Amino acid sequence: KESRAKKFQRQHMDSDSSPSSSSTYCNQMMRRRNMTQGRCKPVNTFVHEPLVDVQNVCFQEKVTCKNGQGNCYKSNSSMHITDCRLTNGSRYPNCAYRTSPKERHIIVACEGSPYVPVHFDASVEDS
């Protein structure tokens, strides 16, 4: 009863929660999202925008992927997100990140049917 896309949602898509995330949000969240299980994540970037939005991206714009195909795409515009990068030389099992409340574009790799983001690449700075 599980799927791939769904995993991506609870992976980077944190819309559920509200903005203004400065506290140890990521520091823990990232770990609570089953991302620090067994090991520690070097970096990450949550999202404060609704999926429906990110999804439209795959239909709004498109971009190249690691392989070199149009498997990737970029949001037609900026989007609320919560930066999350390791800090204090933290390491597994320890995991400390710096929650950075910001809002900008993003690039994700959508696939399958329907066309939804099943992976996250990295956030953008500007158009």
Q: 80 an active-site residue?
A: no
| 82 marked among binding-site residues | no
Residues 54, 45: Cα–Cα separation, whole Å: 14
d(CA 72, CA 59): 11
Coil vs helix vs strand at 66: coil
Annotated binding residue at 44? yes
Choose, from 12, 48, 80, 105, the residue flagged as catalytic.
12
What type of residue is 57? Answer: V
Structure token pair of residue 66: 């690691």
Contact indicator for 44, 30 with CB cutoff of 8 Å = yes
Contact status, residue 74 vs residue 105, Cβ threshold 8 Å: yes
119 is known as an active-site residue: yes
Give CA–CA dist 112/99, Å, rounded: 31
Q: Which amino acid is at 93?
A: P
Give the phi and the psi of residue 108 in degrees, each rounded to 5: -130, 155
The phi, psi pair for 9, rounded to 5°, reads -60, -60
CATH class of the region 1-127: alpha beta
| Phi–psi pair at 109, nearest 5 degrees | -105, 100
Residue 118, annotated ligand binder? no
Going 25 to 4 to 15 to 70, the CA torsion angle's sign is positive
- C-beta of residue 11 within 8 angstroms of C-beta of residue 35: yes
Look at residue 117 and give its three-state secondary structure: strand
Alpha-carbon gap, residue 85 to 72, rounded angstroms: 23
Write down the catalytic residue from 48, 80, 105, 119: 119
Per the annotation, does 6 bind a ligand?
Answer: no
